[PDB]
Amino acid sequence: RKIRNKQSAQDSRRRKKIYVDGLENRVAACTAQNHELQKKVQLLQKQNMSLLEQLRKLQALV
Amino acid sequence: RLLKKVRRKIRNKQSAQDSRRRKKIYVDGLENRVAACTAQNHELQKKVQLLQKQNMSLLEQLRKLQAL
């Protein structure tokens, strides 16, 4: 019936809003996380440089 | 106002059609960020992974030269 679909259409829309808000929030944090994940590679690249320096400093040092 | 209402009500309808035709793009937009940001995030994690054991093998090389 034409009423049956109206309240079925209301839900679809009420529910889309949730889904969009869902992507908004994944996009949100997966991004903010991706970022701090990169800061972790950074601080790790900088640790590897100061570590190998400390090493070879006593390493090839005779 | 005779046709004010017959225009001001049509003008609104296909302004509403665009809004919806345009959200479809935006959603598809998030779908694609969520897509790659995710696939990227992990490859990013694999880089921290290989980097963490680089640091494990060198710090052991170092602290290996102690009483030595």
Numbering used by the authors:
A (entry chain B): 217 to 278
B (entry chain A): 210 to 277
From the paper:
cAMP response element binding Protein 3 (CREB3) is an endoplasmic reticulum (ER) membrane‐bound transcription factor, which belongs to the basic leucine zipper (bZIP) superfamily of eukaryotic transcription factors. CREB3 plays a role in the ER‐stress induced unfolded protein response (UPR) and is a multifunctional cellular factor implicated in a number of biological processes including cell proliferation and migration, tumor suppression, and immune‐related gene expression.
To gain structural insights into the transcription factor, we determined the crystal structure of the conserved bZIP domain of chicken CREB3 (chCREB3) to a resolution of 3.95 Å. The X‐ray structure provides evidence that chCREB3 can form a stable homodimer. This disulfide bond in the hydrophobic core of the bZIP may increase the stability of the homodimer under oxidizing conditions. Moreover, sequence alignment of bZIP sequences from chicken, human, and mouse reveals that only members of the CREB3 subfamily contain this cysteine residue, indicating that it could act as a redox‐sensor. Taken together, these results suggest that the activity of these transcription factors may be redox‐regulated and they may be activated in response to oxidative stress.
